[PDB]
């Protein structure tokens, strides 16, 4: 999680305003439940030395 | 010259000191190599980096902060993290053990053997330091390690250091949300021994901080980064005064004379005025009236606090960003002739004002607004005294029956000091009505 | 025309010095304007005892 | 020739200052970098009044700037004329006020008094005669009621035979910001009736009534309100300045004025204030200024004297007029408002005359009045002092910095009897 939010900067294909109003809740919400599973979690440098 | 030290005592208490340095870091466009661009602002280090970084002839900015903890977990995940470059290595106090959620472990057993060694690392940063106005404590009531480790090096800091201000920032216990029972134990005890010593405990809860998200921000799912977010902004915006400047310049000594009232009870209340979502912000406009109106609206306060059952003493308010002093007057002004608001009739006056011109910012990748007129409303209510009166009563059951006193009186400890703290807690009520009774 | 119409619209035209990043006229008016004197900048010569 | 040093005080009067000093250069047209551009003589004698010379044509003035805050002196220093000021002017401390008046009138001070001691007096030698000195700062300030009480109170000692004026602004009355304002005050005006002789008071909340009466332009900067009182004070100094058939001395003016050596305090007063299609639509004439400068809007300081009555009033015209209409003016109100003063003095108005324009009007004035409209302030104080004192708020700093209920006690006794004073004479 750290990763993510901090170094990772969070998802990047995502939509930025993917958030307006929507159906059941007819409001702004189609932004973030999924959260970002994507691209090498464990490639820091010392781990290959 | 006007320079603070910034302490994070707790794995809870250092990722909230990890998100503002983060955010401290925006500002003043600091990458995270530790170096500006071209631009030349490097030097003996003398710069509005000088009350918060340590950029010396070496170039890298060194942030006057010491994160200390007990499990190397966290601490060492942030040292792999983007700026622990910047990170000195060993002001990233990191421990081998625990403290098992005991205040009297993390305030005996453990807090001895590295007090010393913060010791030495606080003296080093004392004598590298000018001004040094005050300390900047991140901690937590409730603290694994906040509690303990935080209450002896605090007695530790004021006998040797008396002559300075010490600042408390400590999330308060959830009244109603317990993720731990021993809760009631080391709160209370951690309350006793501060009381009389402690200069300005800050509290906070997270609940109403959830409360306000799906209210106006909309967000029924946040995450901590948004909760280290808002209260980082909260600093952020305390610490523009010493960043820069305004039509008038306060400081933290004011703070202290005028918001404390009376000796032991220095517990005020800060609050956020422009708590709005992004797009609100965009089809709408923002003035002093009716934010003075939202700051001072309840449910705008993130403790479940209810004014009308107390009395206000103190309301300092903190305008940053674009503000004339014309409206600001008045609008308070209409706020003294407002029947509702029941300052107590000791104060005539109550109101510290602070104006900033620096605009709040947003953060990349954040969810604040686009701030152009911002305020930080700390303020004392009576209104507070049943929180401990929540507490008491949750304590007084389960003394009683002596619920896992064993682990306590098993680590060398006894009943007597305990004792202690339920008449101090009474002693404070008692004084919270005297004072509230006219 | 709102409240404050008539001068708001003739001032900007005498005050020529507006500043163009958003916001920044206090920052830019921070030392303040020139509403204590005449339009004209110079009445100095006159040896008038 | 008789002289004047300024004592920059404060840190409201640290933008005073900077806003008092840069009007008398751009009246005297001296250029930001010191050149003075030689356009007046008058103005080229009567420089040595307020400014020294240093080489190359650069009137160095001779003002004091004191604070302890580096900050607000870095500000003004990177403001239009801080090259005009001198860094030999600029003493200071390494300590944050707390704005606590103990501290500053105890504790900082003490290691500040003695340099601050040391630069007045050696450009008390570098001039030669003074009439006396001015200080800009305020009575509520934190710091600056520490320090000028403490340097009015060794400056008595060290020539009690000058011009000790005094010039603080009164903070807003409705609301103080500072909750121990009215302790400060308090403190600080027992030995300003003590020490001084001269006393300006003035308001910020007046001037904000004013902004909405003839400057109507909704949002002004505190500079701009700066610039409203340093023209006032600009007047009260054109006098001595400026050549004219007109007694300029503040001697001159203070024994016309103090009718009984405990009256201190003084209201100023003004001359046209302007609004937007006005400056084109006033025929600029002494009735309409008379009217206007005898207007209870117009008036500025604390409020309305229409409440009391009117001891001593002295007005200063600045322009091409003549001693005719002045005296049947005069005459006019005399006639116009009789009752209104006291019966005690009978031609109580002290008229002077500067033949001299301002820099961009011709007909103008300043005003300095005593009159019975300081008893609602005092009185105000009393009852916030008397509830706060009733119950001892706010008070362990200063039994902590070593001060005690001792001196607070003699310190409304002496404003109570300034209450029945004022009361006295006119009551
Ligand atoms: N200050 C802070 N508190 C948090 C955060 N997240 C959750 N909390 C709450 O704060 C409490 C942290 O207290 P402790 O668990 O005693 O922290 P500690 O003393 O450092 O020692 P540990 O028990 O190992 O965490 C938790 O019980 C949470 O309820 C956070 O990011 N910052
Ligand atoms: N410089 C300045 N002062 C202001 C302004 N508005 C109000 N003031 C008041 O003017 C007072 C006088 O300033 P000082 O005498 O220098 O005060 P101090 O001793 O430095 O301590 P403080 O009063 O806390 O500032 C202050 O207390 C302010 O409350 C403003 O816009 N600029």
């Known amino acids: 999680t750290y990763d993510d939010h901090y170094n990772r900067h969070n998802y990047n294909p995502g939509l930025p305003a993917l958030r307006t109003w929507n159906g059941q809740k007819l409001l702004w919400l189609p932004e973030k439940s999924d959260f970002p599973l994507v691209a090498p979690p464990t490639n820091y440098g010392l781990l290959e030395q | 010259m006007r320079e603070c030290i910034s302490i994070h005592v707790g794995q809870a208490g250092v990722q909230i000191g990890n998100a503002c340095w983060e955010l401290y870091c925006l500002e003043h466009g600091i990458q995270p190599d530790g170096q500006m661009p071209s631009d030349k602002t490097i030097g003996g280090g003398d710069d509005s980096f000088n009350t918060f970084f340590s950029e010396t002839g070496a170039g890298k900015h060194v942030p006057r902060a010491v994160f200390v903890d007990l499990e190397p977990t966290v601490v060492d995940e942030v040292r792999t993290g983007t700026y622990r470059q910047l990170f000195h290595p060993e002001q990233l106090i990191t421990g081998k053990e625990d403290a098992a959620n005991n205040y009297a472990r993390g305030h005996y057993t453990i807090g001895k053997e590295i007090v010393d060694l913060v010791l030495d690392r606080i003296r080093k940063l004392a004598d590298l330091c000018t001004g040094l106005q005050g300390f900047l404590i991140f901690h937590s009531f409730g603290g694994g390690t906040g509690s303990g480790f935080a209450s002896l090096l605090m007695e530790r800091l004021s006998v040797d250091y008396g002559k300075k201000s010490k600042l408390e920032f400590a999330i308060y216990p959830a009244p109603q949300v317990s993720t731990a029972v021993v809760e009631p134990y080391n709160s209370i005890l951690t309350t006793h021994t501060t009381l009389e010593h402690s200069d300005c405990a800050f509290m906070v809860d997270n609940e109403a901080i959830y409360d306000i998200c799906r209210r106006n921000l909309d967000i029924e799912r946040p995450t901590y980064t948004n909760l280290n977010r808002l209260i980082g902004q909260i600093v952020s915006s305390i610490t523009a005064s010493l960043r820069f400047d305004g039509a008038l310049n306060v400081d933290l000594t004011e703070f202290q004379t005028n918001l404390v009232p009376y000796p032991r009870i220095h517990f005020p209340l800060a609050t956020y005025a422009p708590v709005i979502s992004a797009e609100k912000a965009y089809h709408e406009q923002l003035s002093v009236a009716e934010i003075t109106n939202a700051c001072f609206e309840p449910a705008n306060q993130m403790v479940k606090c209810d004014p009308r059952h107390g009395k206000y003493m103190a309301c300092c308010m903190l305008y940053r960003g674009d503000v004339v002093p014309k409206d600001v007057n008045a609008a308070i002004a209409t706020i003294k002739t407002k029947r509702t608001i029941q300052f107590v009739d000791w104060c005539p006056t109550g109101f510290k004002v602070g104006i900033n011109y620096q605009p709040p910012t947003v953060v990349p990748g954040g969810d604040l607004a686009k701030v152009q007129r911002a305020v930080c409303m700390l303020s004392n209510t009576t209104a507070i005294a049943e929180a401990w009166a929540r507490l008491d009563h949750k304590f007084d059951l389960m003394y009683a029956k002596r619920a896992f006193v064993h682990w306590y009186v098993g680590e060398g400890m006894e009943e007597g000091e305990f004792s202690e703290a339920r008449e101090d807690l009474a002693a404070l009520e008692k004084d919270y009505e005297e004072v509230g009774v006219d | ?49 | ?427």
């Open chain 3, 1 to 49: 025309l709102l409240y404050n119409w008539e001068e708001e619209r003739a001032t900007n035209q005498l005050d020529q010095i507006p500043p163009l990043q958003d916001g920044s006229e206090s920052y830019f008016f921070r030392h303040g304007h020139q509403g204590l004197l005449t339009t004209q900048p110079q009445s100095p010569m006159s040896s008038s005892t």
């Open chain 4, 1 to 427: 020739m008789r002289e004047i040093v300024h004592l920059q005080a404060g840190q409201c009067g640290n933008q005073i200052g900077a806003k008092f000093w840069e009007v008398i250069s751009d009246e005297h047209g001296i250029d930001p970098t010191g050149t003075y551009h030689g356009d007046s003589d008058l103005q080229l004698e009567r420089i040595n009044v307020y400014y020294n010379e240093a080489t190359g044509g650069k009137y160095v003035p001779r003002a004091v700037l004191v604070d302890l805050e580096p900050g607000t002196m870095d500000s003004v220093r990177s403001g239009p004329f801080g090259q005009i000021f001198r860094p030999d002017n600029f003493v200071f401390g390494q300590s944050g006020a707390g704005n606590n008046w103990a501290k500053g009138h105890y504790t900082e001070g003490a290691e500040l008094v003695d340099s601050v001691l040391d630069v007045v007096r050696k450009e008390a030698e570098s001039c030669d005669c003074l009439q006396g000195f001015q200080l800009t700062h305020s009575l509520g300030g934190g710091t600056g009621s520490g320090m000028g009480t403490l340097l009015i109170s060794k400056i008595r000692e060290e020539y009690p035979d000058r011009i000790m004026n005094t010039f603080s602004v009164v903070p807003s009355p409705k609301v103080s910001d500072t909750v121990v304002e009215p302790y400060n005050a308090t403190l600080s005006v027992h030995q300003l009736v003590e020490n001084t002789d001269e006393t300006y008071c003035i308001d910020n909340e007046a001037l904000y009534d004013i902004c909405f009466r003839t400057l109507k332009l909704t949002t002004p900067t505190y500079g701009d309100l700066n610039h409203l009182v340093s023209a006032t004070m600009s007047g009260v100094t054109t006098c001595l300045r400026f050549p004219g058939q007109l007694n300029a001395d503040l001697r001159k003016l203070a024994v016309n004025m103090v009718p009984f050596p405990r009256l201190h305090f003084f209201m100023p007063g003004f001359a046209p204030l302007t609004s937007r299609g006005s400056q084109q639509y006033r025929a600029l004439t002494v009735p309409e200024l008379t009217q206007q400068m005898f207007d209870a809007k117009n008036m500025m300081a604390a409020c309305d004297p229409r409440h009391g009555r009117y001891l001593t009033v002295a007005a200063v015209f600045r322009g091409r007029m003549s001693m005719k209409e002045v005296d049947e003016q005069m005459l006019n109100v005399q006639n116009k408002n009789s009752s209104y003063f006291v019966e005690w003095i009978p031609n109580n108005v002290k008229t002077a005359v500067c033949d001299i324009p301002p820099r961009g009007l011709k007909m103008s004035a300043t005003f300095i009045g005593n009159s019975t409209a300081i008893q609602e302030l005092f009185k105000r104080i009393s009852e916030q002092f008397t509830a706060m004192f009733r119950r001892k708020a706010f008070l362990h700093w200063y039994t902590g910095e070593g001060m005690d209920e001792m001196e607070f006690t003699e310190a409304e006794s002496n404003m109570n009897d300034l209450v029945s004073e004022y009361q006295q004479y006119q009551d």
